[PDB]
Design a protein around this ligand. Structure first.
Ligand SMILES: CSc1ccc(N(Cc2cc(Cl)cs2)C(=O)Cc2cncc3ccccc23)cc1
Ligand SMILES: CSc1ccc(N(Cc2cc(Cl)cs2)C(=O)Cc2cncc3ccccc23)cc1
Lengths: 305, 305
C-alpha cells in the first residue's frame, strides 16, 4: 500500500541523452538511431531569440558548427534538417543503447516522466501532467532545454515532450518530438503567458479511487448524480468537463473498489461545495489532478517494465 | 525555475535488479559483483514468519534451492551467508553492469530514491525520507521486498535501504545493505507499530528557502527568534528539535537568499500558527519535510550524474 508521485525508471532514456553545442549555446539532445533531436533555438544567441529567422540562421551553418558529445565520445554531424521547432542532426554513429521507442503527442491531463538534464547529463526524474493550458509545472534551470518527457509501455519508450521554455509565471512549455508546440507558444523571446488553467476532473476522480484503495473513504456519500448535473456544478469550480469516455476510462477503478463512477462524482461534487473541513486525502490538503486513471491502476497493481 | 520531488536517475540501479525464488517465495535481489543481496525472509513461508529461526531455516537449504533470474539468464548460486537480516547469495558470474557503489546507513531526515521492483523488474522510482520514527512513507505491494533505496554522488551509487515490510498503518520498514533494521523493527510477523512520527524541521526550513529561491516570500515576517524559543514552539506542533548542526547545514541556503536561519525559523513559527490561509508554497497546502538542505541546493543549482 501507499501512494507516491512515481516516475518511470529512467535507464532507457539516460542512454539517449547527449550535449549539443552551436557557438556559445549548449543544451541537451536525444540520440536515437543515427539522429540527435534538440530544440532548433540551439542555433540562436540570446540576441537572436528576440526575433529569429530560423531558416536564415540555419542556412548559414554547416555540419561542423554542431558539436555533439554523447558523454566522453564526440559524435560527428553528417547532416541537419529542421522539423517544426526541433533540429535533427544526422550523426556518423547509431546509438547502440537506442531503446524500442515511438514519438507520441499526448492530450491535456496525460502524465509523463521528465529526465531533467544539463550538458547531456541527467540531474533527476519527476512526474508531470500536461495541464489543460498546455503548460507543465516542471523543475528546469537554464541549460535544461532538450530534456525529454516519456512514458514506458512494456519495453517501448513513448517520447512525448521536449523542453524549450519557461514562461514568466515559472511554468514550462515545449514540443512533441516532431517539434510541434503544446499550446499557443512560439520559440521567440516575446511577451507570452500561460492561459487560465483548469483542474483535470478525470484525474481527481482517479486519485479519489487511489485514496479508497489505500483505505481513506471519509469523503464517500450515499448520493448519486447524472454526468450532466455533475458537470454543471464542477464547471463553476474551473473543473474540465467529464465526458462519457472519462467515465469509461474509470471503469477498471470503479470495478476494483465497488464505487460507481457517478457515485464518486457525487462525492467530488460534495467536496467542491463543502471543502475538506480540515481533513486530508492521501496526505494532501488539496484535490490532486496529476494522476491519470492508468497511473493509479499501474501503481496500485504493480505492473513492471 | 520550479521545484519538484525529484528522484535520482535509476539506470545504474536498474542494471542490478534480479528475481530471487526460494520454494514458493519470490522477491527482488541486488546483484553487485558476484553477490546477490536480498531479505533473509526469502527462506520463509507465510507460516514461518511468526517466529522464524533463520540460522535453522538457512542450514537446511542447498545452493540449488535458490533460483536467481537476471531477466532471461539463470545465475547459478555457488554459496550463501547471512549478515543480520540480509541473505548474500554468491553466484558464478559477476554483474557486468555493476556500478561504482558503497553501502551507507542514513540518519532520520535523510532522503533517498526507491526503485520499486516486482519479479526483479522495476515498476517506478520515487523520493523518500527516513522518517524520525525510522519508517518510510513508500508505495510497495507484496513482491516489492528487496527493492532498494539509494543516493547518487557523481557515478557512485550509495545503497542505504532494502525493503522488508509494511506496518499496519501502511508505512514501510527495512534495513541498510548490511541487513541492520532502521528502527526497532524485526523480520517476524509479530504485532509491531510505527512510533509517533514527527516533522523533519531542518527539511521544512530547507523547503522554505527553496520557495524563496523560486521567487515566493509571502510567508516571511519582520521577526526573529532564539533557537531555544523556536524549539519550545515547534515541539508543540510535533516538530523535531532544530540543533546548531541543523542551523550550520542551512548556512549555504541562508547566505544565497540573505535570510538568517533564525529569521526563517520565525517565518516557520508564524506558518504553524496561521496556516496558509488558502495560499500554497511550491504548489503544496502543507509544510513539506522530505527535502534536505542538500536536495534544495542540488535541484536549485542543477547538479548532474
Ligand atoms: C538560445 S538562448 C536562449 C535563451 C532563453 C531561452 N528561454 C527563453 C525562450 C525560449 C523560447 Cl522557446 C522562447 S523565449 C527559455 O525559456 C529557456 C529556459 C528553459 N527552461 C528553464 C529556464 C530557466 C531560466 C532561464 C531560461 C530557461 C531559450 C534559449
Ligand atoms: C516470506 S512471505 C512474506 C509475507 C509477508 C511479508 N510481510 C510481513 C512481514 C515482513 C516482515 Cl520483515 C516481518 S512480517 C510484508 O510486509 C511484505 C510486504 C512488504 N511491503 C509491502 C507489502 C504490502 C502488502 C503486503 C505485504 C507487503 C513478508 C514475507
Amino acid at each position: 500500500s501507499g501512494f507516491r508521485k512515481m516516475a518511470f525508471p529512467s535507464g532507457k532514456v539516460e542512454g539517449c541523452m547527449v550535449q549539443v553545442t552551436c557557438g556559445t549555446t549548449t543544451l541537451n539532445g536525444l540520440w536515437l538511431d543515427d539522429v540527435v533531436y534538440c530544440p532548433r533555438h540551439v542555433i540562436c544567441t540570446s540576441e537572436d531569440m528576440l526575433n529569429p529567422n530560423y531558416e536564415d540562421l540555419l542556412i548559414r551553418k554547416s555540419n561542423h558548427n554542431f558539436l555533439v558529445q554523447a558523454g566522453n565520445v564526440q559524435l560527428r554531424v553528417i547532416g541537419h534538417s529542421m522539423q517544426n521547432c526541433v533540429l535533427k542532426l544526422k550523426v556518423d554513429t547509431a546509438n547502440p543503447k537506442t531503446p524500442k521507442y515511438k514519438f507520441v503527442r499526448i492530450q491535456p491531463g496525460q502524465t509523463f516522466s521528465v529526465l531533467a538534464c544539463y550538458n547531456g547529463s541527467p540531474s533527476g526524474v519527476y512526474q508531470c501532467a500536461m495541464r489543460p493550458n498546455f503548460t507543465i509545472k516542471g523543475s528546469f534551470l537554464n541549460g535544461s532545454c532538450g530534456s525529454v518527457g516519456f512514458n514506458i509501455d512494456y519495453d517501448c519508450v513513448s517520447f512525448c515532450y521536449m523542453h524549450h521554455m519557461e514562461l514568466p509565471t515559472g511554468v514550462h512549455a515545449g514540443t512533441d518530438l516532431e517539434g510541434n508546440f503544446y499550446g499557443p507558444f512560439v520559440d521567440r523571446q516575446t511577451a507570452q503567458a500561460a492561459g487560465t488553467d483548469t483542474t483535470i476532473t478525470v484525474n481527481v476522480l482517479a486519485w479519489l479511487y487511489a485514496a479508497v484503495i489505500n483505505g481513506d473513504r471519509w469523503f464517500l456519500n450515499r448520493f448519486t448524480t447524472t454526468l450532466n448535473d455533475f458537470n454543471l456544478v464542477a464547471m463553476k469550480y474551473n473543473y474540465e468537463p467529464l465526458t462519457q469516455d472519462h467515465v469509461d476510462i474509470l471503469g477498471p477503478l470503479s470495478a476494483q473498489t465497488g464505487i460507481a463512477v457517478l457515485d464518486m462524482c457525487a462525492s467530488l461534487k460534495e467536496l467542491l461545495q463543502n471543502g475538506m473541513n480540515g481533513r486530508t486525502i492521501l496526505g494532501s490538503a488539496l484535490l490532486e489532478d496529476e494522476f491519470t486513471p492508468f497511473d493509479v491502476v499501474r501503481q496500485c497493481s504493480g505492473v513492471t517494465f
